Amino acid sequence: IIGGEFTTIENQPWFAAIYRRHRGGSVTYVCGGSLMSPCWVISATHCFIDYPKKEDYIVYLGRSRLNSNTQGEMKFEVENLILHKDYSADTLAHHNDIALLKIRSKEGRCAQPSRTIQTICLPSMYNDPQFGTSCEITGFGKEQSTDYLYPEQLKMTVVKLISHRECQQPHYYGSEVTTKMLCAADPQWKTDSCQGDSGGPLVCSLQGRMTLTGIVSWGRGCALKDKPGVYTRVSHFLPWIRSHT
Ligand SMILES: N=C(N)c1ccc2cc(C(=O)Nc3ccc(CN)cc3)cc(Nc3ncccn3)c2c1
């Protein structure tokens, strides 16, 4: 996350940290997720499509630093990885970038809600915030496009939703962004999501409720001029979501 502020998991309790074990025993950070229901995390199909075996993934809840056990965290394996069957990727844009992970403990249990571990509510059909709304994103992703390491402590920032009409303009994304996707950014291009933040939450306060409005999906550069973050518009996938859970 370019700019913003470090923060800790008690300020984002639905954020899930998804790692992958490799042959030989090392483990590295993959993408973020959001806790939807006690047994289900939602993220982006692009983070898992090239390594689709459910056994390799580790999920943490209640975790604030990349490389330490925070008090109160819980660790999960994946009972079920569901990718969208119509996912695709173009040169920039990705389609139907949405995945579900049914989580379980070694003992067989789903998440146990607590002060650091909580779900985030889905949106309702046809009702997303108006353009210009301020929303937050959180993740362990890059602090500068040229870094090659992710920060050791969790970060957050705030960005504003951008309309389809503006985001379809020639110097922004043209026809490559569709009505299934939401655009969001900083009017001054100083802060943004970036590589390593994919799959994480875009949380919007709407009618007094916090809502999982988008899923971090893609973007040209990070906090580059007239290049917004682009996010999966969760409200279109409520039919798909309910049927696979
Ligand atoms: N600017 C953004 N809001 C934003 C959001 C998501 C991004 C995802 C990615 C990204 O690469 N995701 C990703 C997509 C598909 C696969 C599997 N082949 C593997 C990985 C890259 C971004 N841009 C970036 N630019 C310079 C340095 C680092 N990253 C992203 C930018």
Q: Give the distance, in angstroms, between the CA of residue 44 and the centroid of all CA atoms in the same chain.
A: 7
The superfamily CATH assigns to domain 1-12+120-235 is: Trypsin-like serine proteases (2.40.10.10)
Sign of the dihedral through C-alpha 46, 195, 77, 35:
negative
142 lines ligand 1 (CB under 6 A): yes
The domain segmentation of the chain, as residue ranges, is: 1-12+120-235, 13-119+236-245
Ligand 1: residue of 198, 215, 220 to mutate (most ligand atoms within 8 A of CB) is 198
The answer to whether the beta carbons of residues 3 and 154 sit under 8 Å apart is no
From CA 231, how far away is CA 47, in angstroms rounded?
14
DSSP β-bridge partners for residue 58: 19
Q: Is 53 exposed, middle or buried (0-12, 13-18, 19+ CB in 10 A)?
A: exposed
222 lines ligand 1 (CB under 6 A): yes
Asked, colleague to colleague, whether 1-12+120-235 and 13-119+236-245 share their fold, the answer is: yes
Closest ligand 1 atom to residue 145 Cα is 27
4 lines ligand 1 (CB under 6 A): no
112 lines ligand 1 (CB under 6 A): no
Task: Name the architecture of domain 13-119+236-245.
Answer: Beta Barrel (2.40)
From CA 234, how far away is CA 98, in angstroms rounded?
8
From CA 108, how far away is CA 233, in angstroms rounded?
32
34: three-class secondary structure by DSSP? strand
Q: Could you tell me the distance, in angstroms and rounded to a whole number, from the CA of residue 155 to the centre of ligand 1?
A: 17
From CA 4, how far away is CA 53, in angstroms rounded?
34
**Is residue 171 among the annotated active site residues?**
no
From CA 163, how far away is CA 228, in angstroms rounded?
11
Q: Residue 124 gets which letter from DSSP?
A: P
Experimental technique for the deposited model: X-ray
Q: For residue 181, give the nearest of 126, 234, 125, 136 by alpha carbon.
A: 234
Q: For residue 164, give the nearest of 221, 217, 231, 238 by alpha carbon.
A: 231
Phi, psi of 224 (to 5 degrees): -90, 145
The answer to whether the beta carbons of residues 43 and 199 sit under 8 Å apart is yes
In angstroms, what is the resolution? 2.0
From CA 135, how far away is CA 132, in angstroms rounded?
9
**Is residue 46 among the annotated active site residues?**
yes
DSSP β-bridge partners for residue 203: 136, 212
From CA 97, how far away is CA 88, in angstroms rounded?
8
Tell me the H-state helices in the chain: 164-167, 238-244
Distances (CA, A) of 172 to 38, 59, 158, 227: 38, 35, 20, 6
